[PDB]
Swiss-Prot record:
Homodimer. Heterodimer with a RXR molecule. Binds DNA preferentially as a RAR/RXR heterodimer. Forms a complex with PUS1 and the SRA1 RNA in the nucleus. It is found in: Nucleus; Cytoplasm. One of its GO terms (cellular component) is membrane. Keywords: Cytoplasm, DNA-binding, Isopeptide bond, Metal-binding, Methylation, Nucleus, Receptor, Transcription, Transcription regulation, Ubl conjugation, Zinc, Zinc-finger. GO terms for biological process: anterior/posterior pattern specification; apoptotic process; canonical Wnt signaling pathway; cell differentiation; cellular response to leukemia inhibitory factor; cellular response to retinoic acid; embryonic camera-type eye development; embryonic eye morphogenesis. It comes from the Eukaryota. The keyword Transcription regulation applies. Residues 4-237 form the NR LBD domain. The lineage of its organism: Eukaryota, Metazoa, Chordata, Craniata, Vertebrata. This is Retinoic acid receptor gamma. Belongs to the nuclear hormone receptor family. NR1 subfamily. There is a cross-link at residue 220 (Glycyl lysine isopeptide (Lys-Gly) (interchain with G-Cter in SUMO2)). It comes from Homo sapiens.
Length: 237
């Protein structure tokens, strides 16, 4: 029935808005750490960054638990899905927080870092790609509910590796794909290419993620002391 899809659109949307505050509703603030020029790594900036990344991972898990059906999956699958799609969601999240005019990216507590600071915070040689990915996301003018659905689709993925019940995860994903097409087309009937442009983004996203995992390999050498435990859980993929 249609009322069940509208119900799913509503739940996913609320689940996202509650685990991911919008840019416009955020109390933006700045820091003066290494804003001047690019350096290998500003450690004070990386502590605050890892701290925020860990908080986001928890918010991602929180969001995943509110997605209809996820909890019914085996606990092994739930972990497997999160493990595989966490960086992807993480990348999509910070990218929806791009303010093109100031050329900054805002975090959930309001920390607003300019490109130089993002670089010095840990992004390193991947900074510019991330920023270019966020740029090219702007033209799609997605909203909170579309980002939420898109994020769910990245998560509920049957093609993952150690799934015990891949066939069940595929069925869970089915309505999210219907839900997103129904929603995207209704909001904007004049641009029928939004849905397929959104799905194709999942591929782009997945790519900026493998580069991000790759960047975490290097970073581990540059930082004094082990990377946070939840961040490490995610990278063990
Ligand atoms: C694996 C690890 C720790 C090292 C490699 C790089 C620097 C590439 C990276 C990049 C990201 C991600 O792109 C991001 O910043 N997401 C992000 C999104 C939202 C918030 C928030 O709203 O608070 C915080 C974030 F952290 C996350 C992890 C990592």
């Amino acid at each position: 029935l249609s009322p069940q899809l509208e119900e799913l659109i509503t739940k996913v949307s609320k689940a996202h808005q509650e685990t991911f505050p919008s840019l416009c509703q955020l109390g933006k603030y700045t820091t003066n750490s290494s804003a001047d020029h690019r350096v290998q790594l500003d450690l004070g900036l990386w502590d605050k960054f890892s701290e925020l990344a860990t908080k986001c991972i928890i918010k991602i898990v929180e969001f995943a638990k509110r997605l209809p059906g996820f909890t019914g999956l085996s606990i092994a699958d739930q972990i497997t899905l999160l493990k595989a799609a966490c960086l992807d969601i993480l990348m999509l999240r910070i990218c929806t927080r791009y303010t093109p005019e100031q050329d900054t990216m805002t975090f959930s507590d309001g920390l607003t870092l300019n490109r130089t600071q993002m670089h010095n915070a840990g992004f390193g040689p991947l900074t510019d790609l991330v920023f270019a990915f966020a740029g090219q996301l702007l033209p799609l003018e997605m909203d909170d509910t579309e980002t939420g659905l898109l994020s769910a689709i990245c998560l509920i993925c049957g093609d993952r590796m150690d799934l015990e019940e891949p066939e069940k995860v595929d069925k869970l994903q089915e309505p999210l794909l219907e839900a997103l097409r129904l929603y995207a087309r209704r909001r904007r009937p004049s641009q029928p290419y939004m849905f397929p442009r959104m799905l194709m983004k999942i591929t782009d996203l997945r790519g900026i993620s493998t580069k991000g995992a790759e960047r975490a390999i290097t970073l581990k050498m540059e930082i004094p002391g082990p990377m946070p435990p939840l961040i490490r859980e995610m990278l063990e993929n």
